[PDB]
């Protein structure tokens, strides 16, 4: 006999930790480190703070292979009333607002906590002080998995006599340092290369310390919350927008006020195409009217692009700088494309190419993938970026031979990155994004083609001297 039951979100990820990027102790150790670093970065640069991040990993128990990961930052901290749910309630986040941040699910640190409880018995340790806080608040926490709620094992407070702000998080988990080492270092290095306004200190389980110095004191304009672009906004999103209204808007007012890229004239045209009365109260839209609006948004070809301003890009200068620093190529080029939209979300693709020099020889490019300023490391061959790179005919762009020295970099940034998994690491096959990654790659490949054509012309001239 079939017996029907429900799960809490915590039970769901406890039963299936592989879904959150915790399938084995090597990947788990890596995942915990990056989840904490991403939280610390979102807590600093999103708020105009030059990040100073300290990461330590200690082997606590050799026989059991338990490691303690501690990440300390100079971020905005967390209000003490929010700490228990922030670290101990699955699907709880400050990043569900429409804004480019590394975090997005309200899952990552809880998944590390669940993994922690599944395999050892020490609670997670949080110390935090909000900006201008008179106290440093401390917590020891577990998750009641059935209830999906925090258990406060311990809480305290101490006088903040040094005016410190930020957060320390320490979590004890199974790990495999030897297997995870190269990917943890690659993660931090690739973060650092595109984040020169940050400083990192990293102490590993072998007691090695690496220092990654701040190279610039200029911080990018922090991304902020924005209204959706109408292209690809769906029926449920329309309902959300309507339900959130404090005013009794007409449909016309709703269009101009709740979206980017809609003025009076665009609103009039959308209303005409969708068969909607400008003056009807939007709270009264029917199910079928909502469909018509969503379809109209989808097929409308005259929308202005989203503002480049919901997003934070790496930028052509830095992309090129970083490719040169790491690979010492004969040639490098990059492009930061103009903003597009997919499913209501502004996005930008940036692309870079490096060729020759110290880049090793192979039969395929080295592909460097980033999403919202996070370097992607695992699962590359199923990423949509890899799909696009593989499908491009490099013979069209001057790559004559089967063996060559090329690096290709792609950064996607958006108010929402569509990952294939909650562990992130790879980007899903979304058609508008796929198309724009291709256009961007084609644009830099054209700069490569020019470089290779000039080299070829020189060679041809030299050939005549023979």
Ligand X SMILES: Nc1ncnc2c1ncn2[C@@H]1O[C@H](COP(=O)(O)OP(=O)(O)O)[C@@H](O)[C@H]1O
Cα–Cα distance measured from residue 25 to residue 8, given in angstroms and rounded to the nearest whole number:
24
The residue (of 117 and 310) whose beta carbon lies closer to Mg ion is 310
> Exactly one of 220, 278, 357, 418 binds its own copies (CB under 8 A); which one?
418
The residue (of 7 and 366) whose beta carbon lies closer to ligand ALF is 7
Shortest Cβ distance from residue 114 to ligand X (Å)? 11
> Exactly one of 50, 59, 91, 326 binds its own copies (CB under 8 A); which one?
91
Cα–Cα distance measured from residue 250 to residue 289, given in angstroms and rounded to the nearest whole number:
14
165 touches its own copies by CB under 8 A: no
User: 451-455 contacts: CB < 8 A, separation 24 or more?
Assistant: 451/331, 451/333, 451/355, 451/398, 452/355, 452/397, 452/398, 452/399, 453/398
Contact 439, 35 (CB under 8 A): no
With tokens 């929402």, the residue in question is 416
Shortest Cβ distance from residue 364 to Mg ion (Å)? 32
Cα–Cα distance measured from residue 242 to residue 197, given in angstroms and rounded to the nearest whole number:
40
**Residue 243, annotated as binding a ligand:** no
φ/ψ (deg, to 5) at 34: -70, -35
> Exactly one of 145, 319, 349, 407 binds its own copies (CB under 8 A); which one?
145
Structure tokens at 195: 């984040």
The residue (of 109 and 126) whose beta carbon lies closer to ligand ALF is 109
**Residue 367, annotated as binding a ligand:** no
The residue (of 127 and 379) whose beta carbon lies closer to its own copies is 379
The residue (of 39 and 260) whose beta carbon lies closer to ligand X is 39
Q: CA torsion, points 330, 440, 34, 30, in degrees to nearest 10?
A: -70
Question: CB under 8 A: which stretch of 164-172, 251-259, 331-339, 427-435 binds its own copies?
Answer: 427-435
The residue (of 108 and 346) whose beta carbon lies closer to ligand ALF is 108
Cα–Cα distance measured from residue 173 to residue 117, given in angstroms and rounded to the nearest whole number:
8
Q: Determine if residue 410 is left, alpha or beta; phi over 0 gives left, psi from -120 to 50 gives alpha, anything else beta.
A: beta
229 touches its own copies by CB under 8 A: no
Shortest Cβ distance from residue 318 to ligand ALF (Å)? 23
> Within 10 Å of residue 249's Cβ, how many Cβ atoms?
18
Structure tokens at 427: 């980007």
117 touches ligand X by CB under 6 A: no
Contact 32, 112 (CB under 8 A): yes
**Residue 444, annotated as binding a ligand:** no
Stretch 398-417: interaction string toward its own copies, x if CB under 8 A: ------------------x-
With tokens 């200068």, the residue in question is 317
Contact 128, 83 (CB under 8 A): yes
The set of residues, in sequence order, having a beta carbon less than 8 Å from that of 292 and lying 6+ positions away, is: 274, 275, 276
Kindly identify the residues of this chain, within the stretch 52-91, that bind ligand X according to CB under 6 A: 73, 75-78, 86
Count, residues near ligand X per rule CB under 6 A: 23
Cα–Cα distance measured from residue 78 to residue 158, given in angstroms and rounded to the nearest whole number:
15
457 touches its own copies by CB under 8 A: no
Cα–Cα distance measured from residue 224 to residue 242, given in angstroms and rounded to the nearest whole number:
22
105 touches its own copies by CB under 8 A: yes
**Residue 95, annotated as binding a ligand:** yes
**Residue 241, annotated as binding a ligand:** no
94 touches ligand X by CB under 6 A: yes
33 touches ligand X by CB under 6 A: no
**Residue 93, annotated as binding a ligand:** yes
The residue (of 51 and 398) whose beta carbon lies closer to its own copies is 51
118 touches its own copies by CB under 8 A: yes
Question: CB under 8 A: which stretch of 18-26, 256-264, 322-330, 331-339 binds its own copies?
Answer: 18-26
The string of DSSP letters for 16-71 reads: -GGGGT-SSHHHHHHHHHHHHHHHHHHTTGGGT---EEEEEEEEEETTTTEEEEEE
* Nearest Cα residue to 318 out of 349, 350, 340, 347: 350
Count, residues near its own copies per rule CB under 8 A: 65
**Residue 430, annotated as binding a ligand:** no
9 touches its own copies by CB under 8 A: yes
**Residues at the site binding ligand ALF, with contacts judged by CB under 6 A:** 35, 38, 102-109
Cα–Cα distance measured from residue 395 to residue 401, given in angstroms and rounded to the nearest whole number:
8
Kindly identify the residues of this chain, within the stretch 291-350, that bind its own copies according to CB under 8 A: 291, 294-295
Q: Quick one: what does residue 418 bind among its own copies, Mg ion, ligand ALF, none, with the CB cut-off 5 to 8 Å set by partner type?
A: its own copies
Question: CB under 8 A: which stretch of 8-16, 32-40, 154-162, 407-415 binds its own copies?
Answer: 8-16
Shortest Cβ distance from residue 11 to its own copies (Å)? 8
Cα–Cα distance measured from residue 429 to residue 101, given in angstroms and rounded to the nearest whole number:
21
* Residue numbers belonging to the annotated binding site: 39, 73, 93-95, 104-110, 424
Which residues does the annotation place in the binding site for ATP?
39, 73, 93-95, 104-110, 424
Q: Which residues bind its own copies (CB under 8 A)?
A: 2-9, 12, 14-16, 18-19, 23-24, 27, 64, 76, 82, 85-86, 89, 91-94, 96-97, 104-106, 114, 117-121, 145, 234-237, 287-288, 290-291, 294-295, 379-382, 416, 418-423, 426, 428-431
């Amino acid at each position: 006999k079939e017996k029907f039951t429900s799960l809490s979100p915590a039970e769901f990820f406890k039963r299936n930790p592989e879904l959150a990027g915790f399938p084995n102790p090597a990947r788990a150790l890596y995942q915990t480190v990056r989840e904490l670093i991403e939280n610390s970065l979102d807590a600093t640069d999103v708020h105009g703070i030059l990040p100073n991040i300290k990461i330590t990993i200690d082997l606590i128990d050799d026989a059991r292979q338990i490691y303690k990961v501690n990440v300390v930052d100079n971020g905005i901290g967390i209000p003490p009333q929010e700490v228990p749910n922030a670290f101990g309630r699955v699907l709880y986040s400050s990043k569900y607002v429409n804004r480019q941040t590394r975090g997005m699910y309200g899952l990552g640190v809880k998944a590390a906590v669940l993994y922690s409880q599944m395999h050892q018995d020490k609670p997670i340790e949080i110390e935090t002080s909000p900006v201008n806080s008179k106290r440093i608040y401390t917590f020891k926490l577990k998750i009641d998995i059935n209830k999906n709620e925090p258990i406060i094992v311990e809480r305290g407070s101490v006088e903040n006599t040094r005016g410190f702000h930020g957060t320390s998080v320490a979590i004890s988990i199974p790990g495999d340092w030897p297997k995870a080492k190269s990917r943890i270092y690659e993660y931090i290095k690739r973060t650092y290369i595109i984040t020169p306004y940050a400083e990192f200190i990293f102490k590993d389980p072998e007691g090695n310390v690496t220092y990654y110095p701040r190279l610039t004191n200029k911080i990018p304009k922090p991304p902020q919350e924005v209204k959706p672009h109408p292209y690809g906004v769906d029926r449920e999103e329309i309902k959300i927008l309507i339900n959130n209204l404090k005013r009794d808007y007409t449909i016309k007012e709703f269009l101009v006020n709740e979206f980017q890229s809609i003025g009076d004239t665009t609103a009039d045209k959308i209303l005409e195409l969708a068969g909607l009365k400008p003056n009807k109260k939007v709270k009264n839209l029917t199910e079928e009217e909502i469909t018509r609006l969503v379809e109209t948004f989808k097929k409308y070809e005259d929308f202005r692009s989203p503002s480049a301003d919901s997003l934070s890009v790496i930028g052509e200068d830095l992309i090129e700088l970083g490719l040169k620093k790491i690979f010492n190529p004969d040639f490098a080029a990059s492009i930061t494309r103009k903003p597009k939209a997919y499913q209501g979300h502004p996005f930008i693709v940036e692309a870079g190419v490096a060729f020759g020099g110290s880049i090793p020889v192979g039969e395929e490019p080295i592909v460097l993938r980033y999403a919202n300023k996070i370097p992607l490391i695992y699962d590359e061959k199923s990423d949509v970026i890899w799909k696009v790179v593989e499908e491009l005919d490099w013979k069209r762009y001057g790559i004559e031979s089967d063996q060559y020295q090329m690096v290709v970099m792609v950064h996607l940034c958006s108010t929402k990155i569509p990952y294939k998994s909650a562990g992130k690491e790879s980007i899903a096959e979304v058609e508008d994004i796929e198309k724009e990654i291709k256009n961007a790659l084609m644009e830099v490949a054209r700069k490569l083609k020019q470089y290779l054509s000039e080299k070829r012309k020189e060679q041809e001239a030299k050939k005549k001297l023979l």
